[PDB]
Amino acid sequence: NLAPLPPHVPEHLVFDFDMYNPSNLSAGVQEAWAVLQESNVPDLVWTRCNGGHWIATRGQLIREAYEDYRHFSSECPFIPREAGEAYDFIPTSMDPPEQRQFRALANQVVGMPVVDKLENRIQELACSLIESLRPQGQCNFTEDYAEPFPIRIFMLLAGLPEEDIPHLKYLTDQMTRPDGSMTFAEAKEALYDYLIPIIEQRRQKPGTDAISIVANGQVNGRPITSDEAKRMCGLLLVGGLDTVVNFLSFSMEFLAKSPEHRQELIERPERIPAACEELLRRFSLVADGRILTSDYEFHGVQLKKGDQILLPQMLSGLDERENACPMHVDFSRQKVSHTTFGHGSHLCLGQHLARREIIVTLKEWLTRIPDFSIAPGAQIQHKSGIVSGVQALPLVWDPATTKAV
Ligand code: HEM
Numbered sequence: 001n002l003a004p005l006p007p008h009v010p011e012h013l014v015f016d017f018d019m020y021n022p023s024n025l026s027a028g029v030q031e032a033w034a035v036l037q038e039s040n041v042p043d044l045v046w047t048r049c050n051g052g053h054w055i056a057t058r059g060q061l062i063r064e065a066y067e068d069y070r071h072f073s074s075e076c077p078f079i080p081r082e083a084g085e086a087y088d089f090i091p092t093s094m095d096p097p098e099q100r101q102f103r104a105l106a107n108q109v110v111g112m113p114v115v116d117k118l119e120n121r122i123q124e125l126a127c128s129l130i131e132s133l134r135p136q137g138q139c140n141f142t143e144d145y146a147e148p149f150p151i152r153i154f155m156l157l158a159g160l161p162e163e164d165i166p167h168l169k170y171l172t173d174q175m176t177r178p179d180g181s182m183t184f185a186e187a188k189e190a191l192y193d194y195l196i197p198i199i200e201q202r203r204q205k206p207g208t209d210a211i212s213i214v215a216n217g218q219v220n221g222r223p224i225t226s227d228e229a230k231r232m233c234g235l236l237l238v239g240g241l242d243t244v245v246n247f248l249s250f251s252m253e254f255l256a257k258s259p260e261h262r263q264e265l266i267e268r269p270e271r272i273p274a275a276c277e278e279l280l281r282r283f284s285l286v287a288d289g290r291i292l293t294s295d296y297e298f299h300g301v302q303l304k305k306g307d308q309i310l311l312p313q314m315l316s317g318l319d320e321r322e323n324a325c326p327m328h329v330d331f332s333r334q335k336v337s338h339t340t341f342g343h344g345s346h347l348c349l350g351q352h353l354a355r356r357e358i359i360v361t362l363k364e365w366l367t368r369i370p371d372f373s374i375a376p377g378a379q380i381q382h383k384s385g386i387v388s389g390v391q392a393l394p395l396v397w398d399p400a401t402t403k404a405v
C-alpha cells in the first residue's frame with residue numbers, strides 16, 4: 001500500500017518504511033527498524049507506505065508525547081485504518097474521571113490470588129511443556145512452548161477451556177498482524193459473540209475467575225455490564241494472548257544464538273528481573289498510534305485535533321538520548337528509561353503477568369535445557385506490525401546435556 005505525497009509535508013522529512021515490512025525480513029525487529037535513527041534523520045518522518053502515516057524515530061519525542069494526556073491520547077493505539085475504524089476497548093477508549101473505576105476493576109480482574117492457589121500447577125504447566133520436548137533434541141518454541149504456556153495460564157485466570165485456544169489466538173493474531181478477508185470489525189464481532197454466552201453465564205453463575213469478576217464488579221455506584229465486560233476483555237485477551245506470546249519467542253531467539261548469556265541466567269537466577277527489563281528494552285516490539293487532542297507544531301508543519309502519529313517502541317528502546325547501550329546487551333545495567341510500559345498519560349495494566357511468565361520462563365527452561373541453538377539449515381523471519389511476532393522458532397540441542405527437574 002503506497003500513497004502520493006500530501007504537499008503540506010515538505011519532502012526532506014520523507015522516509016521509505018512500512019510497519020509490517022520494516023527494512024529487512026532477516027533481522028530482529030529492533031534491528032529491522034533501526035535505519036530510522038541515522039544521524040541525518042529528523043525526530044519524526046512521513047512514510048507514504050500503508051496509505052500514508054507519521055512516524056516518530058526518537059525515544060525522546062515518544063516519551064514527551066507519553067507524559068501529558070491533554071496533548072496526546074492512547075484512545076486508539078492501533079494506527080492502520082482497518083483497526084482505526086473498529087478498535088474501541090475498555091479502559092483505554094473510555095473518558096476520565098470515571099475511566100479510573102474501570103482501571104481498578106481491570107487491576108483486580110488481573111489479580112494474582114486467583115492464580116496463586118495454582119503456582120505449583122503453573123510450575124507443572126511449564127515442566128509439562130518442556131518435558132514433552134527435552135529428550136527429543138529439538139522443538140519449535142512458538143508452538144511448543146510460547147502459545148501453550150501463557151495462554152494456558154490466562155485460560156486458568158479466566159476459567160476458559162484449552163480447546164478454545166486455536167480460536168482466540170487466531171483472532172488476536174489477525175487483529176495485530178492481518179492477511180485474510182476477516183477485517184478488524186469482523187475479528188471484534190466474532191470475539192464479542194464468543195465472549196457474550198460466557199459473560200451472561202457468569203452473570204447467573206459467578207465463580208473464582210477474572211471473567212466472573214469483569215461480569216460483576218462495581219464501578220461508580222453500579223455493576224459493570226456485559227457490553228463493557230466484552231469490550232474490556234478484547235484488549236485484555238490481545239494482551240495475554242499476543243504481547244507475552246511474542247515476547248517469549250524473541251527472548252529465546254536471542255538466547256539460542258548467545259551461549260554466554262545462557263550461563264549468565266544460571267550463574268545468577270536472582271538477577272533475572274534486571275535481564276527481563278533489559279530484554280523488554282532490547283526487544284521493545286510495540287508500535288502505538290498516538291491521537292492528537294488539539295494541536296502540535298514542528299519544523300514548520302502542524303498537526304490537527306483528531307490526527308495521529310505512530311511511536312515505534314522498538315526505537316524508544318533504542319534512542320541514544322534515553323538509552324545508554326542501544327544494540328549492546330548486558331544483564332547488569334540499572335533501570336530502563338523508555339515507554340514500553342507507560343508513563344504519564346496512560347499505563348500498562350497487565351505487563352506484570354507477561355514479565356512474570358518471562359521471569360518464570362527464564363528459570364524453568366534453563367534449569368532443564370541450559371544449551372540450545374536454532375536448527376541447522378533453518379532461518380528466522382520476524383513479523384513486525386502494531387504489535388510484532390515471529391514466523392516460528394525451530395530449536396535444537398544435544399538431549400543428554402539436560403537433567404530432570
Ligand atoms: C510484556 C508484555 C507487554 C508489553 C510490553 C505491554 C506494553 C503496553 C504498552 C506500551 C501500553 C500502552 C501504554 C500507554 O498508552 O501509555 C499497554 C497497555 C495496556 N496493557 Fe500492556 N503490555 C504487555 C502485556 C500486557 C498483558 C499481559 C496484558 C493483559 C492483562 C496487558 C494489558 C494492557 C491494558 C489493559 C492496556 C491498556 C492501558 C491503559 O489504557 O492505560 N498488557 N501495554
Ligand SMILES: [K+]
Pocket residue numbers: 075087088089093
Ligand atoms: K473510541
